């Protein structure tokens, strides 16, 4: 497991990213970044 940005910022209630790519968003507050996970 490595975790990446995937450039993209999403919000609460919407959670925008591109396809393959999700948000570790904090609780949906407010606002986060996109990620992806890669590995085993």
Same mark, same amino acid.
Request: glycine share 16%; net charge positive; with cysteine.
């Given at each position: 497991?490595?975790?990446?940005? =995937?450039?993209? /910022?999403?919000?609460?209630?919407?959670? !925008? =990213?591109? !396809? %393959?790519?999700?948000?570790?968003?904090?609780?949906? /507050?407010? +606002? %986060?970044? =996109?990620? +992806?996970?890669?590995?085993?």
């Amino acid at each position: 497991f490595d975790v990446v940005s =995937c450039n993209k /910022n999403c919000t609460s209630g919407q959670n !925008e =990213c591109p !396809e %393959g790519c999700f948000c570790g968003l904090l609780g949906q /507050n407010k +606002k %986060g970044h =996109c990620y +992806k996970i890669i590995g085993n």
